[PDB]
Amino acid sequence: MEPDGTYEPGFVGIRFCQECNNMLYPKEDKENRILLYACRNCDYQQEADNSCIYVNKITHEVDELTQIIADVSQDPTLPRTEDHPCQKCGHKEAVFFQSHSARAEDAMRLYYVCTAPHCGHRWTE
Amino acid sequence: HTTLRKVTANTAIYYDPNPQSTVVAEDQEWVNVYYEMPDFDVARISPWLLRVELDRKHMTDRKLTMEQIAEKINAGFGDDLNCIFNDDNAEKLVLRIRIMNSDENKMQEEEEVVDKMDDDVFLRCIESNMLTDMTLQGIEQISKVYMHLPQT
Amino acid sequence: RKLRRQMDIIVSEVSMIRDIREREIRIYTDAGRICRPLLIVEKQKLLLKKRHIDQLKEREYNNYSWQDLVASGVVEYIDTLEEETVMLAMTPDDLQEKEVAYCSTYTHCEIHPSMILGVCASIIPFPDHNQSPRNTYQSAMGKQAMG
Amino acid sequence: AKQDVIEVIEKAHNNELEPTPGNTLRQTFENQVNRILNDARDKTGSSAQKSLSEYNNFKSMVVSGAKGSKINISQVIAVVGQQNVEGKRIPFGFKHRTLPHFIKDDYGPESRGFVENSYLAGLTPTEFFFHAMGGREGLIDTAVKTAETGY
Amino acid sequence: GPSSQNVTEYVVRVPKNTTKKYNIMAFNAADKVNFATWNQARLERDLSNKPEDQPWLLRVNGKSGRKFKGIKKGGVTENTSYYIFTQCPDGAFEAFPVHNWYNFTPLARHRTLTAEEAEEEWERRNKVLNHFSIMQQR
Amino acid sequence: GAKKSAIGQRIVATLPYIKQEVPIIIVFRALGFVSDRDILEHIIYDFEDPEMMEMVKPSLDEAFVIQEQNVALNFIGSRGAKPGVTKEKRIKYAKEVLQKEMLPHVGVSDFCETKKAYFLGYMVHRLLLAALGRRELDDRDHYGNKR
Structure with a gap:
């Protein structure tokens, strides 16, 4: 309580x-x-x-948990960052992007999708 | 012009006809806090429960009190809107709302001219009015609008 | 796409686009879309090699042509809807030097950047050292001259 | 100036940044990068003004007050500067990009507007096209304004 | 056994001409149909309100049993074919052509709200003001 | 009045040669999919998200006045055509409009009447996405959307 x-x-x-x-x-x-x-x-x-x-309503719906399918990792026009180690897989080369959408809200917070296997894991920093 | 809609994080409607055994066991001590509140016509008031959660950050900026908001809404709607509120001693702020009826006359005479829409559905119209029309310290219609400037 | 490079479906025709974040694949074969030729790059480098150039010099006495060049699959046709989803290097030079300079995911490259100009704008020499509307008045007047 | 912008982008991506009062985070980010690129432009323009020899024909027309202004000398000698439509920086006409030549989400000054070169050095292809967008605003406004004042 | 290692091989036959047309009867999985609980069924073309183009009417068990509507697919295939592979008592396979593909969907035993009365008129008055009582006045 | 304290989800449909706006749900009834779960399946094949489910719900609430294909057809006929107490012809004419006039690119016959239902439903889905705002609002002048 x-x-x-x-x-x-x-x-x-x-x-x-x-x-x-x-x-x-x-x-x-x-x-x-x-x-x-x-x-x-x-x-x-x-x-x-x-x-x-x-x-x-539910305030700042960080709804980061869904929508963004792992397949987004394949897009050549998205930047590959050398920042490393998906927290799960022992591999670097994360793909990243900001927010998107009309409910980009106002955050500028990067969203990171690893592109290596041994995960397909999504996380923010 | 700050509307309750700006301050509100979220709303929820529950069926909780027994406060003494509320649907949120964690909410249960605040019910303990309110039993002296018209205990005779709790058999008469409606069983539908409205529960609201408020943003601490909006609440800090507008430097409001929960009793100011409760007094605003009760005053705005009228005696029908039975309000009680959570303890200030939390980072979160939540408000629990039930509706009282007209008591004596509701004995089902002809057919109770309301056309028997569900009281909850009436509650959503309450919440609608409650979000858009409620004007705590929102003394006018100046959109949301302001900024403050220092001139040298 | 491999089929398109091999011409089992008409290059100039089929546009084929994938919108990954929405999981859609749009394909277009209707008349009336504006498209342009671009070089193909592959594995972080250009797919066109100088041997294709030596056939183009050879055209002075051979049947080899721009259509053969499209048949090598070293150039592609890209409409404006599809051009949104490609990662497009400005010039072979930039696609070459790259290591950690910018990115390495390019998929097309520009056959020459000054091609963005229309017919009358190409008469005007050093158009990029001019103030932009100045170029627009010349495109009207050049069309206005006599000869 | 360019390195300092990257510092502001890194502060924004790190979410270390906070909004200025009365505005949103994008507006603040945009207000801040715009303040940096203009200030850069004016400092460098003022440098170019300082270097002009007194014999120079170009400086004699501006200083006499015959034609053109101090800002023209800046653009010719130092840097063309920011391009912009409807006030703001070049819009993401593509999906989150300005030209296919750039990577998605590149607020850095070049992919979105600002031209480094001078009219003497020549504009790079992208710089060239973004300049034409800024020049078009000037052509269209002349025609639209002419009709309305007339009425 | 098949759980470890197994190999089977059966000849496949096609009769020159079937003695009957083979059709597909598809249901929505969401309807979770179990024929175990069917005891009778009738299947007849709805035709009275105006034959081989007309929709199907599926009537299960008695009058009080569930009724379904069968809608014809435009064609069996537009560039291929669909075939049924069946096991025969000799131990062979037998393959049969699809002649039609029909979609079959559920219908309510008794619902019927009807708009012919003045429901449309009530809609003109509709302020979301009633719901149960109109269903009762029926 | 005290309807829903927020009409900002009452999704209607214009149709060709129809004198009056109709709610999308009638058209689905007219396609014959009386099952509300099935209409919901055409609209949004991911009923796992509560927010989409709530977004459509008042449009379902409107649907109750009409609950069969024929009468729904009689609604579209009378809302669309010149007056004709014939009822059944109003239904047949309207049936032919839905067959011929609406989304004709998806077909022109009975034998592809199902295919039209998904596509109309896709537009509502395409619209709901924008209405959640997780979908960009589409530009007026993107060249990919020109011919």
């Missing part, structure tokens, strides 16, 4: 109706005081899994 830490509960909007294959919405059981998920177009109902139904 501390100010410091993190919170990534893994949002859920994919457990659609199994009976007619359509989207599920939250709904109340006032009798059991429990969340349920129902398809609007049929009588099908099923109990929930988490008390969360919706979230919005």
Whole structure:
């Protein structure tokens, strides 16, 4: 129970109706005081899994963890840096680039993709 | 013109109808902090829980207090918006919001003219209004705008 | 591309582009795209060798031609969409000296940089020692002269 | 000046840099590199002004106040200087580049605008083309401004 | 055994002409269809609302059983062919031509919201103001 | 009013010879893919990201008024054509428009009606990417996008 830490509960909007294959919405059981998920177009109902139904924003989403596929390492127009040793593989020749995207946000922080095998590992400095 | 939207890191909506057994076990002592807060109509207030997280850095610049924000929103919306807040003794800052209803009249007479949209869905409209329209120390409409200059 | 260098699909035609960060492959064979010839470089060096030049001198009495040169696959045609994704050396000189000077990933090279000029701009000598709009007034006036 | 820019890029990539108040990090980076390349330009121009002999025909036209200015002498003798469109440095017209000749993400002064050479030394091919972009702004503005003031 | 080392070799036959057309019936894996729980099925061309071009109607078990829609693929192949390789009691392989490729997809036993009434009108009024009750008034 | 406190995700579609804007979801209904999971599969083949899923959701919410291909066709017919209480012809004419007029480069017949569904869906995907902003906004004058 501390100010410091993190919170990534893994949002859920994919457990659609199994009976007619359509989207599920939250709904109340006032009798059991429990969340349920129902398809609007049929009588099908099923109990929930988490008390969360919706979230919005998450500050500076470092979303560096995804999107950037390892294959980016092949592009000849991207710079090869002699700065060395992928932290995983015992090999230098990292490929790097800044940020990209309209949510380049404002950081100028380099993102590094090793190009050697024995990893395919992504990291920032 | 600082809107609550500028200060806010994130928002979340939970179904937590039992504060005494809240969905975030770590949040549980603050509920202990609030039981004297209208304990009779907790059977009457809605079970949907709104939870907000705030940026410490925005909060420092605007040099605000959590009680200033709580008093701003309660004053802005009205008595319906039941607010409680976390302890100042943390680097993080979070605010927990429930909605109170009209109490006595909700006995389902004809059909309760609301057309029975879910109260949560009403809560998202609350959060929408809450982000865009709330103007803590945002005394006007000067976009976001400023800068300060020293002239010699 | 190997097929393109070998001409199983028409050079001047097929444009073929990969957008790695999006995982897309676009290929174009419609009319109307603007493209230009460039030299191919490979393994950090030029693929065209002086022996191809000796055939070009030979053309004065032989059937060898620019089309043969394209058939060696030592030059390629590049449209503006594809030109975005190539790493393009300015001149053989720069692609040679390189060691840790800049990069070594080049894929094409310029057959001559002064080719970026259009027909009238080429009449004007030392165009790069002139202020740029000065060159534009000459391109109008040169077209205006008589003879 | 060029080595000092690389120092500012390294400070930015290291994320050691912090924004100036009232602005974003890119705007600060851009404000800072622009302050360096202009200051470089003016220091070197002032050097070129200092070296002119008194017999020089070129110095006599500017000093009399017949035609052209001190800045023209700078460009002819020392360095053409920064190129720019709509105020800012040459935009990344390609994917994160200015010309295919450069590597992706090269804020260094040459890949993005700034020409080292003087009109006497001649402009390198890239320097040449970026200059034509800066000259076009001047041609277009003449035509557009002419119509609007007329009205 | 096959887990260690094995080699098999079977002749492949093609009959000059099949006694019947061979077709493909494809389902979405997401529908997780199990024929183990099918006991009856009917399969007939939907044709009444206007034959060999017309879509398929798949009706499983009784009337209350699941119904599916079968849509014809434009062609079996545009530059190749698809063939079925089958095991025969002699121990050979037998190969059969594909005549058609059909896509089969699920349909609801009873849903039907219908827009013919004034749902379109309600849309004019739609301020996201109701959802359950309209489904009840049906 | 108190609809969603942020309409900034209500994605509509213009179509040729249609007098009124329609939401993209109707067109998918008109292609016959009633299954919301299937439309979601055409729109964004990576349902693993919660943010994309939330971005489409209010557009799904609009879809409820129409829940079958025929009526959806009757919607596009009446929203697009001159008035005609014939209903069924409005459906057949609109059926032929979707067949002939929309994205004709992807096909001109029933036998390639599925192929059009992915491509329309790709545009919504291509649009959502920009709307997340992880995708650059495309230039007005890039020469790669000229003929």
